[PDB]
Amino acid sequence: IVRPVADFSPSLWGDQFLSFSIKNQVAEKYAKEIEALKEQTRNMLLATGMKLADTLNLIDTIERLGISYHFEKEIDDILDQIYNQNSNCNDLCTSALQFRLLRQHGFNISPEIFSKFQDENGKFKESLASDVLGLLNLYEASHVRTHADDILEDALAFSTIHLESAAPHLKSPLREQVTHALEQCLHKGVPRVETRFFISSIYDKEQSKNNVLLRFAKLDFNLLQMLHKQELAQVSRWWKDLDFVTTLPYARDRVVECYFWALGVYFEPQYSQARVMLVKTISMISIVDDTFDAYGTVKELEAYTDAIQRWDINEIDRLPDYMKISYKAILDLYKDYEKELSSAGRSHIVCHAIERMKEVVRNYNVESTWFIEGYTPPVSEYLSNALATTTYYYLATTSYLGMKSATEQDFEWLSKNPKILEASVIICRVIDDTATYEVEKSRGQIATGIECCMRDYGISTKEAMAKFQNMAETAWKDINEGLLRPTPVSTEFLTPILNLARIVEVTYIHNLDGYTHPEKVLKPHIINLLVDSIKI
16 A cells, blocks of 8 residues: 655656757758768778778778768778788787777677787787877777687776876877777767767867868768657657656656667667667666566566566456556557558567567566565576566667568577677676665665675675676677677677667766666766757
């Protein structure tokens, strides 16, 4: 009968997103100049007789500027060529960037390219400590390691200590790029977030900047932002006419933050339908989470869990009134997905995301049973249940729904919990528990990941958190390895999973829960991405 106290902060945003009306004269004009600029940039890429270092810096800059999604065939062709020519006679700067760009695109370049920069013990020659650009590219490259790249185990520490030492005396914008890299490396960042910083804080301030590229990048970032703002408007209108803000007061109102998540997974225009389906799923499973977490009684949660398993509108009446609200909304949402896809013949694939939802909810229920009984499972058993409650198997499966190129054989792959997906789920799991340990512990949670780990192994909280960090590191090595060719599905279907690991890194930065507490971290991100245009 008696419910908990609701210490959730309300949406920072209000209705400032509910109605955006594109200025079409502007949009049509940005697009007009962009087509012209696109071809200029393409000819830059297909220009013959460029040196190696120049080619890599070109591709690098086009990627950091956020426009590389325009030139996927042209960039692949060039990198493919570089991979096969085996250019092993350069400095640290060009070598490190060559290794990173090729690895990021699935080209298994050998790490022995770095041997000429190391003495005996495979430790980097300290005589390189004064080459700042080399250190910066090594820093970035060190984050794409797989398990076969032990040659690079010293790279992060070596480059970090010397970049820190050099930083204060460097010129601008180099200093700001260095400082930002030490806080957020490129490989693990949300693309639009890094792109926004690079375009405005760095490239725009560089003495050597290419005016064509900076122009292209500013107009492209502002044009896509208009698309994102229309998307957020229709999603905000959707969330509004659902009115969980008042009929389900206990839940987190975070539909903007959910859109930021969906924007992290993919930002390109061809994924606009996929983006809208995803944000709706995310915001809705967030409602269900909060119901198990800090509202529903044990008997209520049992009925809810079984009703979901049966997926039948005939079953609503077993639920309390407040659960009827979210239960119908859920079933309605998937009815909507089926009709949204029927005009392309892809309705059936919606059953895959449904089955992953059922699995999420079963495991919410187990988490609650455990909490009621005061059971502290062994780490093995805790993970068997807690990996799915991340919702990451669910969100990954959902991200394929709006992708027109997704086939059945791609859902077959995902459904077998392939390595790359499991790594992304683990990273989410252990980063969450590290961040939410203290608070959730003081709410009486006896079965937190860190607590299971302590009790199981007989190790202090510090040793336990350290161990959870290694599972994250291991998982990032598995992610990077899962991107190497030949890939088991199209790269197009790996990127969302990689992008889901990125979101976790970005959202829980500095060891805090950014979704539940969006002001410190997520707020400036959503502003730079969805409120403020780049000063053109």
